[PDB]
């Protein structure tokens, strides 16, 4: 893994975005930026050449699964690995996200330890 990979953290709750950014900081990943919704995340990915996306699944403008579908339907962005954040990994939710093309999921509240594990898993 490259500690300098460019990561976009997406969620409507500023406090949560900050917590994720800080946990990533603990793991040595400091090249992190933020978006408050799928609608503001897309243009950042479209013009920013990111390497990884950590998105919450529940957002009011454009939902997490739709951000994922938009990423996968765009020739320029479909390569992007995506980690979804969920309040509970219900089988139905995980199966749908998997069919939509998600790389992995993490259940909140989560720790830096678990985040590290999920990243390794995804980055392969
Ligand atoms: Ca949310």
Author numbering: 5 to 128
Published text:
Vibrio cholerae contains multiple copies of chemotaxis response regulator (VcCheY1–VcCheY4) whose functions are elusive yet. Autophosphorylated CheA then donates phosphate to the response regulator CheY. Phosphorylated CheY interacts with the flagellar motor protein FliM and influence the direction of flagellar rotation from counter clock wise (CCW) to clock wise (CW). As expected, both VcCheY3 and VcCheY4 possess (β/α)5 fold typical of the response regulators.
We have solved the structures of VcCheY3 in Ca2+ and Mg2+ bound states to the resolutions of 1.67 Å and 2.2 Å respectively. The Ca2+ (or Mg2+) of VcCheY3 is heptacoordinated where four coordinations occur with protein atoms and three with water molecules. The average coordination distance between Ca2+ and the protein atoms is about 2.4 Å while this is of about 2.1 Å in case of Mg2+ which is due to the size difference of the ions. D60 is the site of phosphorylation in VcCheY3 as it corresponds to D57 of StCheY. Both in the Mg2+ and Ca2+ bound free state structures of VcCheY3, the side chain of W61 (that corresponds to W58 of StCheY) is observed in a conformation, substantially different from that of StCheY. In the free state structure of VcCheY3, the side chain of W61 buries unusually deeply with a χ1 of −135° and χ2 of −133°. Y109 stays in its ‘out’ position and the side chain of M88 (with χ1 of 64°, χ2 of 175°) stays between W61 and Y109, packing snugly with W61, Y109 and V106 through hydrophobic interactions. This packing essentially fills up the pocket, required for the ‘inward’ positioning of Y109 upon activation. Moreover, in this inactivated structure of VcCheY3, the crucial T90 of β4α4 loop (that corresponds to T87 of StCheY), which stabilizes the bound phosphate on D60 upon activation, is hydrogen bonded with Q97. To the best of our knowledge, this kind of interaction involving the Thr of β4α4 loop was not observed so far in any other response regulator. In VcCheY3, T90 and Q97 are oriented in such a fashion that together they form a capping on the aforesaid hydrophobic packing and at the same time block the ‘out to in’ trajectory of Y109. Therefore, the hydrophobic packing of W61 with M88 and V106, together with the hydrogen bond between T90 and Q97 and the water mediated interaction between W61 and E100 seem to make a conformational barrier that may affect the process of activation in VcCheY3.
